[PDB]
Amino acid sequence: MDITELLAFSAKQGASDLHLSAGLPPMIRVDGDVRRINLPPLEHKQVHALIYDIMNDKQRKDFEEFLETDFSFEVPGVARFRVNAFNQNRGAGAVFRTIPSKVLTMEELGMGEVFKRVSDVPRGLVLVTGPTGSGKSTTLAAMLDYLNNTKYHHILTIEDPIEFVHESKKCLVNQREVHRDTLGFSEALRSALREDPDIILVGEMRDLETIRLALTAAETGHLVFGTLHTTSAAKTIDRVVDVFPAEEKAMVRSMLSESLQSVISQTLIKKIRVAAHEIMIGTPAIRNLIDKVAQMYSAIQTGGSLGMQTLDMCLKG
Amino acid sequence: MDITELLAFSAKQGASDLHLSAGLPPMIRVDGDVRRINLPPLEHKQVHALIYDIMNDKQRKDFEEFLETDFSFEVPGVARFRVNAFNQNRGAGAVFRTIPSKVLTMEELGMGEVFKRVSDVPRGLVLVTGPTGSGKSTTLAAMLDYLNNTKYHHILTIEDPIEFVHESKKCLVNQREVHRDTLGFSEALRSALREDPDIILVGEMRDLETIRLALTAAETGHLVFGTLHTTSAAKTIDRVVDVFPAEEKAMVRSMLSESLQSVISQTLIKKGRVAAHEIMIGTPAIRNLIREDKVAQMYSAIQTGGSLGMQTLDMCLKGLVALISRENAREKAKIPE
Amino acid sequence: MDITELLAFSAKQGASDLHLSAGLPPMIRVDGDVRRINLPPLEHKQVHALIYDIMNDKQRKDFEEFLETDFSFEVPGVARFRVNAFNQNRGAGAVFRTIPSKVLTMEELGMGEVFKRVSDVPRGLVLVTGPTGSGKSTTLAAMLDYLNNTKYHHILTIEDPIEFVHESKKCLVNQREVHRDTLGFSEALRSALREDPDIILVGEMRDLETIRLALTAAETGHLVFGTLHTTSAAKTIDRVVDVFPAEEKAMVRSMLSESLQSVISQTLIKKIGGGRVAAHEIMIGTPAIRNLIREDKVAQMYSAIQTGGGMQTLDMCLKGLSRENAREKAKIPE
Amino acid sequence: MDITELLAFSAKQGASDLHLSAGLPPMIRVDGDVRRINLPPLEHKQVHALIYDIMNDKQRKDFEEFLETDFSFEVPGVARFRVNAFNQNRGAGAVFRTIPSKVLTMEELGMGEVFKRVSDVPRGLVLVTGPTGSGKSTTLAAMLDYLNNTKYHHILTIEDPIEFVHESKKCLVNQREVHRDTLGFSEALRSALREDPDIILVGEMRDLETIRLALTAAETGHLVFGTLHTTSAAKTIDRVVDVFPAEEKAMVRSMLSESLQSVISQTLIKKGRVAAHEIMIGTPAIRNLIREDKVAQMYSAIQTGGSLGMQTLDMCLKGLVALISRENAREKAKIPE
Amino acid sequence: MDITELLAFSAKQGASDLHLSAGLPPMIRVDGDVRRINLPPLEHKQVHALIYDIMNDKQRKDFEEFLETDFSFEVPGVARFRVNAFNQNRGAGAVFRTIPSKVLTMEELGMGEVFKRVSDVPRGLVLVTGPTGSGKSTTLAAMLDYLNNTKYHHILTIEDPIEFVHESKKCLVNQREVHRDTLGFSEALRSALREDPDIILVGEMRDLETIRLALTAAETGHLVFGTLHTTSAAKTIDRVVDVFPAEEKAMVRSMLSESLQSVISQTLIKKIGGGRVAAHEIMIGTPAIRNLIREDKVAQMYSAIQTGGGMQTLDMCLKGLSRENAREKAKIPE
Amino acid sequence: MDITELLAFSAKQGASDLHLSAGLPPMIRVDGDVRRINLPPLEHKQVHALIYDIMNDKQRKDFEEFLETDFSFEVPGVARFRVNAFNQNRGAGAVFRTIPSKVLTMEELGMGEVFKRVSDVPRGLVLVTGPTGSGKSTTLAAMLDYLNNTKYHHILTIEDPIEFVHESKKCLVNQREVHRDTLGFSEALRSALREDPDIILVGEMRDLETIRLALTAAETGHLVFGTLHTTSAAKTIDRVVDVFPAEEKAMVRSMLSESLQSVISQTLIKKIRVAAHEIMIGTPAIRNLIDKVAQMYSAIQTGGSLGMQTLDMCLKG
Ligand SMILES: [Cl-]
Ligand SMILES: [Cl-]
Ligand SMILES: [Cl-]
Ligand SMILES: [Cl-]
């Protein structure tokens, strides 16, 4: 009995995660809960076996050198998994996070015109944020899909790794997977500025160079999508400007305030699982606001007739 | 004659610590006093022997590289210990702190709903602080236990070394011992952000980046547990923000003010003894107090926070009239009277 | 069937770009749209073959070492292309951007006296801005050409990389391509200050360095053209001053306010019945506006331009020109 | 046919510049126009030949390393030139700026006592500024000449490349050409501080450290000469202080305010043509103006500084009614009227 | 005649230092004065010989590589010396500082109950300060000894390098020498917080790090002694708080004001009729003074001490004791 | 005819500097003036010869590598010279600055009790500053001499290079010449803190480490002398604090304000050549002043009865 059977089983169960922990049977997180599969506990040896069985030298070298490591792993028919191996008090430990295979519709998600409208801006920056778990990628996928269905454009994405896979419809879609198709977000980004892209998607925004660059893309005339694990328009902004050395905030705050087209912060809630969105749209007033970002909320609250909304506001809905 | 026999003997003696020091016989601390066991003095060779005999490569490598190291060590039937080896003028030296094996639950510790409520927050930051001796951990352990008993979640802790060992009950509990299971708090923390944890216990605030990281964990949607040596909500906050370079306080003070779910500062008093807790709970008002710098006016905030179940330490103290006494109480009050 | 035939075909089609993407037939961007050529999809092997067939060792070495690379490639009778090879989920990928071959004229673009007048200022700063797409380079080129045809001066350009290539007519034209002819904008700029230039072209101006220097060039008595991607005189200004550390804005705002000769922001629009035509916002240096700059009251710039009538609001220009089509590019729709 | 014949021919033509550009025949700038000489176009090979033929290793090494380089070059009977080699789209490129061989003295330039007085200060900073074309150097040269004729001092200059060449008269004159005699302004400057110089001419303000250093030279007790492209005392100051990181302006503004002995901003006007000077002299009042940030109120300071011999540029302009004209004058006035 | 005979002779003379300097006879510092021994001058060769004769390869290798080096050296019956070899204009040079052999008592130093009382606080911070010369170490040692003789506790010391060596009496005494037993004050300090120490001795406290940590030790419930070179309670405080970045003083001033148990500044004076006696300024923790600290009103500290009478002003202490001799060490002469 | 004869001749002439410059006869600066010796001009070859003749490989290697170099050079009976070689438009160039051989008396210099008093402080910092040329070293030498004559102490000096040489009188005097006896000011300084020194002299204060260290010496209980090329007590202070990163001024300003015992700024004037001193003495008031250093002057002006004096004040004298 090997890790594929297990992984396969996770998927068939709708599991978002598979957890291996020396000393316990495999468990899966489903609808947020983490629960044992009806199988015998896995002793250290076993889990460690299971793990090594799907790593290569490098990975095996790290894991042993640094006691923990990350890599992705694919189950051909089933799905791809993000995989983190680590050691704990009882022995080996690995968690598998299943990656959304299918890129779902906008209607399928019940998203409205507001989204299209945002997706339609000719250029500038759009940030779709949300606590790691709120399915950012999907909203994104859907918005991307929407353009791929309506514009004869060139969507260039940079993912670490690639999440959904899109089919080139009206758009040339080129997805580059960090570490396989490209050396990193910054390298890839630079190239992008000369790959004739219309729309650029940047998965993770780990280092400043990625931000820095991403901004120049928005500034030089493209439409760019990136994501932060901020949970609020206001926080999102702060987050972006605040990670820069004092001596450089101005230039960033300035840039952003000019290219920021909209910010969407998302989050999942248990359905009588449905997504709540805070929506903030670019607006001459808000532009300015971008050091008085404090007075952003009430701005969004009165932004209704453009389609904006407080998260709480959305909630009550 | 090996270190187990010794360790076992400590326990049988109710020793809180066993001390090995090249040049002296083993000694144990009991009821606070440190006293030689009726054995011959241990020469350097011996203690260093005794020590390596229970270490592994890594540990041996550190000790050798950094002249000192920590790790935990278990005596199967007897108890677990917290082991620090170091060198001193006379030769090798090692101190063993026995780790509480048996867990007290909130019940066993007489902790009330307030605690559960706190433990129950979906995400954010919770700091359980207190001097050493104060018993912060037990409280912690009890809180963690409480969720492990009631939620199907994933508790991930990052201790140095591991405090109490938990049995996965309703929770997947993964405890990682720094230096053995992981290279350090920061490395471990990062991984955590992608190990699908619900609750993260950060052992100590090993350094700025540990804080930095710990905060982003609270921010991105995990309940995070951490601890300080601060003895007051107010001080605890200050302590957190103040250890950052001026150029960066804002972003920290801002963060904290958003993710701080509650602060509990504890301390032991001679009953046995019994724990006094200052309890401060997250609250739109207090939030500001933090965001803004007006942390000064926090105290009266807590004093009127009664109905969320908050409490001044002193406030708590007076209660303990009901075990405790005044004499001592005065000795720990913030404002004796 | 090889990449030349394709490239050739792009040009014949007026394509601005040729795109190769393993898994899809070749596509070209024309009038801003990207569309498949009526050819069979190119499998990984093929595109990768096509690519390598035109690269040399170095290029092939990089591409393989760094998974992506750039280089230029020429089709003798047809045109030169700036070529980026990269890898994507489906296999190889390469995009060919055709480079303007002809250094093309001011009449041909229907630009008026206003432009000449601007081009004619003896010294100072001229910024031609606009975001990728609006081919200002084209207008710039035309303006430069204009002088190259009328003044016995020395035009010295610093481009990364050289866009249009000019032939020395009445002017000595020296174009330096960053990274080939020079180490960088700043290095090049300094030299320029002692290369006896009349007119200096600074390709892009995205950096404190380049800006700083560009300004001193304008200040020491030269005519300097620079460019941006801002879409508005007002924004352009803000953009320049705002990218400097607080402690230094004054000196920049001050400088600019003295050397700024004119700002032109451009943009392309779908010509009613095929094609596309450029709309220009034009703002000219003027004692009043100078202040507006030196002081911080750039806000009240708009109305200044509106009463500056050869100046013009972009919207103003628009109306001049498919209705809803444009009102779609207004700063105030209607 | 070699570069000398050409250079010689330039001079005979009154050319201010000779231009070599791979792909075109040699051209010269005369009366501001640039025009081809009646010779066949020069292919890359040729111009690159011509060039190396007059460079030495170092120069050749730079050109090769940094794709461009500067140096001076002399035609014995004819004149000295300022040589920059660079590459352009068509191939090699080089521009020769002829250096004024003959010196005009204050007399020949009609400069008055004000200048001598300034040149005579025992130590401190003197900035002679002006756009290119303005003739700042000549003035400079003349000032330097003046002391070289009257003091038994040691003038040390650090040009890139060397402007005018001086003959040691009453002064030991040591001119160091950056890239040939010295690695750079900063390296050279440091040495200067221990070469027993009285007067130091710094060519250009190559960079922050050049400024930094130049200032300490003024501060430690040397007369220092420097130049900017600024066209006004007020701007000159701003320019100096403003190019420093915020965190450091104070120390610069402070320094300057103490060592600034005088600022002269110059400019040429169509007579021939004739030079207009704005003159600003060090003065306890103005000092403050600098130390404090109130440089704004400098202008009126100069306007009442008449008796030390200070003068607004405009002020100076109107004088030139006596050659010059209004039409033009308006064109350079700070406030046309 | 070798360096042992000399060293031995120093000790017999009560010398604190032996100095070798090529070109001069050996000299010793006694009672603060440095004076030649009645011996012939030592030529370069000699001192250099004398030196090398007691060094080993490593030491000889450094000395030659880095022109100077340190190491310790012991005279079996007599004492250990901390030894620095260096080169000077005349040739070799070496200075021998004798290290206190005996961990010497509180009576022997005529220190009173005040000291015991201080030493007896269960936890908090105690600072014994004074500049090089005033051998506080001595008082410190005596205080530590006092507890080592009366409490069954664990004294853990962190010294660079270990000064007096204590024998474990009622206390477990662990002394760690920075650079030999530990990598640094901070590393060592951290470990300490989990070595079950009762009393912690931090040799010197000259660094944000060491201070920071030292404080947390006092804060988490320990008794920590640290030292300085300040010569006054008031100055001592200032000195601690003032070496921190503005943005962090509060937290430090706050901490200190809570853990500061007492400050002792010391100094030596020439005992009327030979020798020397120590004068101590004594300042004790006190609710009032606490505030004075937490608040910034440290100024009004003096009068606080003056009315704190076991506390004492230094001057106050002085009068207690050759007249003009002292009035020479007053904060207010007379 | 070689460079020794010349150098010798300089000394016999009271020259402060000998200048060699390809294209001109040798010249010497005397009483501030620089004048040709009655000798034929030195062609490039010659001066370059003369120079190489007294350099060694290293020096010759630098000079050629870096087009300029420094080193010292001694004329056995005569004096030691600081020597800077450089290249100029005409060829080689070298300047020789003669170093004060003799360390002169305090009386010989007509310096008063103020100086003794300063020299007598048991510890702390004393800065003798003055434009490179004002003979700082001498005032210093004299003060040092004064203690060497009156205290049984250990004077340790660190010079680059050694200027005057002192004879151990009542003091153990140990002079260490940077680059010969020690690797640098910082290395040497550190050692000093454990060489049982009473008084420490630090010639140059090039880098912060030297300052930093020098201060800790003053702070830990020694008397330290150092020099800056500042010309004023007020400037001197500023100079010291201002060269430190913002994040560290406090600690420096704080330290200094506690250890600063006195500042003396000097300068030479043409005698009907006599030294003018500005004298500033440590003082509870001034201590505080050390950010209000601005209000320092008037403090010194009223400091008379302690012995302080404005430079100008001194001048009129
Ligand atoms: Cl505890
Ligand atoms: Cl374009
Ligand atoms: Cl000029
Ligand atoms: Cl001592």
PDB file of N, CA, C and O in Angstrom, chain D residues 1-6 20 26 37 39-40 42 50 53:
ATOM      1  N   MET D   1      47.475  59.547 -44.044  1.00  0.00           N
ATOM      2  CA  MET D   1      46.747  60.707 -43.450  1.00  0.00           C
ATOM      3  C   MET D   1      46.312  60.406 -42.008  1.00  0.00           C
ATOM      4  O   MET D   1      45.477  59.527 -41.773  1.00  0.00           O
ATOM      5  N   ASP D   2      46.887  61.144 -41.056  1.00  0.00           N
ATOM      6  CA  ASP D   2      46.751  60.834 -39.636  1.00  0.00           C
ATOM      7  C   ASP D   2      46.003  61.916 -38.889  1.00  0.00           C
ATOM      8  O   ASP D   2      45.700  62.975 -39.439  1.00  0.00           O
ATOM      9  N   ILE D   3      45.749  61.662 -37.612  1.00  0.00           N
ATOM     10  CA  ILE D   3      44.894  62.553 -36.833  1.00  0.00           C
ATOM     11  C   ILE D   3      45.490  63.934 -36.575  1.00  0.00           C
ATOM     12  O   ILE D   3      44.763  64.898 -36.321  1.00  0.00           O
ATOM     13  N   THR D   4      46.806  64.038 -36.627  1.00  0.00           N
ATOM     14  CA  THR D   4      47.411  65.344 -36.463  1.00  0.00           C
ATOM     15  C   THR D   4      47.005  66.270 -37.600  1.00  0.00           C
ATOM     16  O   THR D   4      46.440  67.336 -37.362  1.00  0.00           O
ATOM     17  N   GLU D   5      47.300  65.871 -38.833  1.00  0.00           N
ATOM     18  CA  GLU D   5      46.923  66.679 -39.976  1.00  0.00           C
ATOM     19  C   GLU D   5      45.507  67.193 -39.756  1.00  0.00           C
ATOM     20  O   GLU D   5      45.244  68.393 -39.881  1.00  0.00           O
ATOM     21  N   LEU D   6      44.596  66.275 -39.427  1.00  0.00           N
ATOM     22  CA  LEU D   6      43.209  66.637 -39.173  1.00  0.00           C
ATOM     23  C   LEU D   6      43.095  67.691 -38.095  1.00  0.00           C
ATOM     24  O   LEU D   6      42.580  68.780 -38.326  1.00  0.00           O
ATOM     25  N   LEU D  20      34.936  62.475 -34.916  1.00  0.00           N
ATOM     26  CA  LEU D  20      35.195  61.273 -35.681  1.00  0.00           C
ATOM     27  C   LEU D  20      34.040  60.347 -35.429  1.00  0.00           C
ATOM     28  O   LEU D  20      33.721  60.066 -34.277  1.00  0.00           O
ATOM     29  N   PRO D  26      35.335  62.890 -41.304  1.00  0.00           N
ATOM     30  CA  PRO D  26      35.542  63.782 -40.185  1.00  0.00           C
ATOM     31  C   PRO D  26      34.706  65.056 -40.329  1.00  0.00           C
ATOM     32  O   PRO D  26      34.497  65.540 -41.446  1.00  0.00           O
ATOM     33  N   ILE D  37      34.177  67.476 -43.358  1.00  0.00           N
ATOM     34  CA  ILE D  37      35.348  67.936 -44.080  1.00  0.00           C
ATOM     35  C   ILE D  37      35.343  67.259 -45.420  1.00  0.00           C
ATOM     36  O   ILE D  37      34.783  66.178 -45.551  1.00  0.00           O
ATOM     37  N   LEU D  39      36.465  65.032 -47.140  1.00  0.00           N
ATOM     38  CA  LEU D  39      37.242  63.803 -47.128  1.00  0.00           C
ATOM     39  C   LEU D  39      36.315  62.602 -47.164  1.00  0.00           C
ATOM     40  O   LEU D  39      35.143  62.710 -46.814  1.00  0.00           O
ATOM     41  N   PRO D  40      36.837  61.440 -47.583  1.00  0.00           N
ATOM     42  CA  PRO D  40      36.033  60.228 -47.689  1.00  0.00           C
ATOM     43  C   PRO D  40      35.569  59.767 -46.316  1.00  0.00           C
ATOM     44  O   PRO D  40      36.245  60.029 -45.320  1.00  0.00           O
ATOM     45  N   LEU D  42      34.929  57.766 -42.948  1.00  0.00           N
ATOM     46  CA  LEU D  42      35.848  56.903 -42.232  1.00  0.00           C
ATOM     47  C   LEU D  42      35.163  55.629 -41.754  1.00  0.00           C
ATOM     48  O   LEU D  42      34.248  55.675 -40.934  1.00  0.00           O
ATOM     49  N   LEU D  50      43.034  55.404 -36.063  1.00  0.00           N
ATOM     50  CA  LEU D  50      43.330  56.779 -35.708  1.00  0.00           C
ATOM     51  C   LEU D  50      43.357  57.001 -34.209  1.00  0.00           C
ATOM     52  O   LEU D  50      44.261  57.654 -33.686  1.00  0.00           O
ATOM     53  N   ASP D  53      46.025  55.018 -32.151  1.00  0.00           N
ATOM     54  CA  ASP D  53      47.309  55.570 -32.530  1.00  0.00           C
ATOM     55  C   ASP D  53      47.758  56.672 -31.591  1.00  0.00           C
ATOM     56  O   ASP D  53      48.945  56.960 -31.501  1.00  0.00           O
TER      57      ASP D  53
END
